[PDB]
């Protein structure tokens, strides 16, 4: 039939869905757990700082939303009836790899900085804007990955 849509083509698009969900979930979980260790480590001495110290946990929960958006946008294009060439499968796998590894690296950075910045916050209350500033610099990496996956998604369906 068609030499452009052979029947092994959905394997790569489903691999893109799997990578975009699993590695974004891994980055979000690393960030959340590693920051929560420091948040509950400061909790014995100064328990009045925990409700402001939940910035790195909320910050590293947006990364799972990035992976969620890109995974549902890839899975909306797959169907057992459509044409679906191999070019679309390579683009979907590249979308998944972009979002997954960008969110994994971003979640690792958020976890490290959030742990040390919350643990060393029980001493200096003027250290908070630096925490929020470096966390904002760590958050944008997953955003860059999601931007290139949105562009690859709208490029691949042509």
């Amino acid at each position: 039939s068609n030499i452009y849509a052979p029947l092994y083509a959905p394997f790569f698009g489903f691999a893109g869905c799997a990578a975009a969900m699993v590695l974004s979930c891994l980055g979000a979980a690393i960030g959340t757990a590693k920051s929560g260790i420091g948040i509950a480590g400061i909790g014995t001495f100064k328990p009045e700082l925990i409700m402001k110290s939940l910035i790195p946990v909320v910050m590293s929960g947006i990364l799972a939303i990035y992976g969620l958006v890109v995974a549902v946008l890839i899975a909306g294009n797959l169907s057992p009836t459509e044409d679906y060439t191999l070019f679309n499968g390579f683009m979907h796998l590249s979308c998944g790899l972009c979002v997954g590894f960008a969110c994994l690296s971003s979640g690792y950075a958020i976890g490290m900085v959030g742990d040390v910045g919350v643990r060393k916050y029980m001493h200096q209350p003027r250290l908070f804007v630096g925490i929020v500033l470096i966390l904002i610099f760590s958050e944008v990496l997953g955003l860059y990955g999601m931007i290139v996956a949105l562009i690859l998604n709208t490029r691949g369906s042509e």
Partner: protein
């Protein structure tokens, strides 16, 4: 990460040591201990803490400051022996390395008492029951340091630490034993630092490295401030007593090794940032105790770490020292300096 493979063996030990940690005395409890009039009031006030029913079944009239510090130390030692029995692998090794540093002090104490012809049983008590090593009372024979070493010390775990101690080859007096003991503790700290660097996982690794750094720096400043007594010491014969670990070795133990007066030590410590706040004021030992308790407090913020055992050990020892000082000030009617305990919690 660190919370992944830790709990498999050490989760129960970590939880029990945190439960021991929650019974550390805070400031209000020390103030309530300060407000006691007699010593039975101190007993009744300590009864409502984690200690309680520890001086039960003693007496109402045989209550003495020495008896209180004996029993408050024995509770510490039984808790440490329980936690050491419940461990294996690297944690068992780590706690044996905690024990060896008191074994060194027992060696020096037994030799020093053997020089002055004291009794075996007098030196066998007040000899810190945690660093035992079964062949310890045999150190009271055969005064010469070689005839200790080729007979009983090679089969102890303190055997690889005498690699420097065979320079002088005569009978010992009180300064030779201290030179020996300082070489022991130097080689000991460097053995335990190279142990922590290669086997202990990372969040406990950095905490144990900074705590061992402070141990080495405190003993370096103490040797530099005690070596300017009435003797002549070559800087080559003094720099073999300052450990090669800490934040003042790469270049600041050099000026400690080359120093004559107290102002030489002040100028030596003047460039290290954490120090040179100490020598221009009062009790120079309380600054080391306060900084040790602040570092040990900072060690309790890491959760998946076996630095908690060392930090709790040192905190509970400071707690026993504080209760002994308060009991002395109560029993001797010397309430002027009763508030000189060190409380960080």
């Amino acid at each position: 990460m660190e919370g992944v493979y830790f709990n498999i063996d050490n989760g129960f030990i970590e939880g029990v040591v945190r439960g021991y940690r929650n019974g550390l005395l805070s400031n209000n409890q020390y103030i309530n201990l300060t407000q006691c009039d007699t010593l039975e009031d101190l007993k009744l006030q300590l009864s409502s803490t984690d200690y309680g029913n520890f001086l039960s079944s003693v007496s109402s009239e045989s209550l003495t400051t020495s008896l209180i510090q004996e029993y408050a130390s024995s509770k510490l030692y039984h808790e440490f022996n329980y936690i050491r029995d419940q461990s294996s692998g690297s944690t068992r090794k780590f706690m044996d390395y905690i024990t060896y540093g008191y074994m060194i002090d027992n060696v020096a104490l037994m030799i020093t008492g053997t020089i002055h012809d004291r009794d075996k049983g007098e030196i066998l008590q007040r000899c810190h029951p945690l660093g035992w090593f079964d062949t310890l009372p045999t150190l009271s024979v055969a005064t010469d340091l070689e005839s200790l070493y080729e007979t009983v010390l090679v089969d102890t775990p303190l055997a690889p630490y005498f690699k420097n101690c065979f320079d002088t080859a005569e009978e010992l007096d009180d300064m030779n034993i201290e030179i020996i003991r300082n070489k022991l503790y130097k080689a000991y700290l460097e053995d335990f630092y190279n142990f922590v660097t290669e086997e202990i996982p990372e969040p406990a690794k950095e905490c144990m490295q900074t705590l061992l750094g402070f141990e080495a720096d405190r003993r370096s400043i103490n040797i530099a401030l005690n070596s300017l007594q009435s003797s002549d010491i070559d800087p080559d014969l003094k720099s073999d007593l300052l450990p090669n670990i800490g934040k003042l070795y790469p270049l600041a133990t050099f000026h400690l090794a080359q120093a004559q007066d107290f102002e030489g030590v002040r100028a030596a410590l003047a460039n290290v940032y954490e120090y040179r706040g100490f020598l221009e004021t009062g009790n120079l030992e309380d600054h080391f105790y306060q900084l040790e308790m602040e570092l040990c407090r900072d060690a309790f913020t890491q959760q998946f770490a076996i630095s908690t055992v060392w930090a709790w050990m040192k905190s509970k020892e400071q707690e026993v020292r504080n209760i002994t000082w308060i009991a002395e000030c109560i029993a001797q009617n010397q309430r002027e300096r009763i508030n000189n305990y060190i409380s960080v919690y």
